[PDB]
């Protein structure tokens, strides 16, 4: 089955998912590799990383695959393993701009939905429901003050104002899925949240 870990910004959802997967001996689906793959393919093909229709045609055309493995995921394009090229400074430079294109996000989400279970992943991509039928859903919540507090401490004021905007922006998603098990992480360490999650699976 699929285990999903969701929550607001700076909720520690990714760190938790990575530990949960590691403990279960399953892969953790980190979206970053696919966005990097998209950037890489764009730069290699001479396709402007700002040209969405051109990039999408290229990505869909090549047939991209996320090989999920407990020891580390791989990304293949037309059967070629590109994984070792995804963290260079040229890819780093344009990857964010690429990830801001809505059609690329949808492409990434479709690549995520093709991976055969089991694995741990984030159930949502902002307002998009990526793994709505996962057998084990968990929602990690905490006050913006505690999330900001941990994120920083004088900077607390700044970090907080940022988190509050994202919370304001992401109002509709500031709630768990109907069948999600909720955990307030206030007063708990990373290891404690991980333990709590594993204990409810």
Ligand X SMILES: Nc1ccn([C@@H]2O[C@H](COP(=O)(O)O)[C@@H](O)[C@H]2O)c(=O)n1
Residues within the interface to ligand X (CB under 6 A): 30-33, 35-36, 95-96, 99
Q: Considering beta carbons, is residue 98 or 148 the nearer one to ligand X? A: 98
Nearest residue to ligand X, by Cβ distance, number only: 32
Residues 6+ apart with CB under 8 A from 51: none
Q: Considering beta carbons, is residue 58 or 95 the nearer one to ligand X? A: 95
- Under 8 Å between Cβ of 29 and 121: yes
Beta carbon of residue 33, minimum distance to ligand X (angstroms, whole number): 6
Beta carbon of residue 125, minimum distance to ligand X (angstroms, whole number): 7
Q: Considering beta carbons, is residue 26 or 34 the nearer one to ligand X? A: 34
Q: Considering beta carbons, is residue 88 or 96 the nearer one to ligand X? A: 96
Beta carbon of residue 166, minimum distance to ligand X (angstroms, whole number): 13
Q: Considering beta carbons, is residue 44 or 156 the nearer one to ligand X? A: 44
Q: Is 21 exposed, middle or buried (0-12, 13-18, 19+ CB in 10 A)?
A: buried
Q: Is 45 exposed, middle or buried (0-12, 13-18, 19+ CB in 10 A)?
A: middle
Report d(CA 153, CA 163) in Å as an integer: 15
Beta carbon of residue 104, minimum distance to ligand X (angstroms, whole number): 9
Beta carbon of residue 35, minimum distance to ligand X (angstroms, whole number): 4
Angle in degrees, 0-180, between the axes of helices 52-62 and 102-114, rounded to the nearest 10: 20
- Under 8 Å between Cβ of 80 and 40: no
Residues placed in the known binding site for ATP: 7-15
Nearest to 110 by CA among 86, 135, 130, 134: 130
């Amino acid at each position: 089955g699929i285990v999903t870990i969701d929550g607001p910004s700076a909720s520690g959802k990714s760190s938790v998912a990575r530990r949960v997967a590691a403990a279960l001996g399953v892969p953790y689906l980190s979206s970053g590799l696919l966005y990097r793959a998209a950037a890489f393919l764009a730069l290699r093909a001479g396709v402007d990383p700002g040209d969405e229709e051109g990039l999408l045609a290229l990505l869909e055309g090549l047939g991209v695959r996320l090989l999920a493995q407990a020891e580390g995921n791989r990304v293949l394009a037309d059967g070629e393993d590109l994984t070792s090229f995804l963290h260079t400074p040229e890819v780093d430079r344009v990857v964010s701009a690429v990830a801001r294109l809505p059609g690329v996000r949808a492409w990434v989400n479709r690549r995520l939905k093709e991976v055969p279970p089991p694995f741990v992943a984030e159930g949502r991509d902002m307002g998009t429901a990526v793994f709505p039928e996962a057998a084990h859903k968990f929602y990690l919540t905490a006050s913006p003050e505690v999330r900001a507090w941990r994120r920083a401490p004088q900077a607390y004021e700044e970090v907080l104002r940022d988190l509050l905007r994202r919370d304001e922006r992401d109002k509709a998603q500031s709630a768990p899925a109907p069948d999600a098990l909720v955990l307030d992480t206030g007063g708990m360490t990373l290891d404690e949240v991980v333990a709590w999650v594993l204990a409810h699976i």
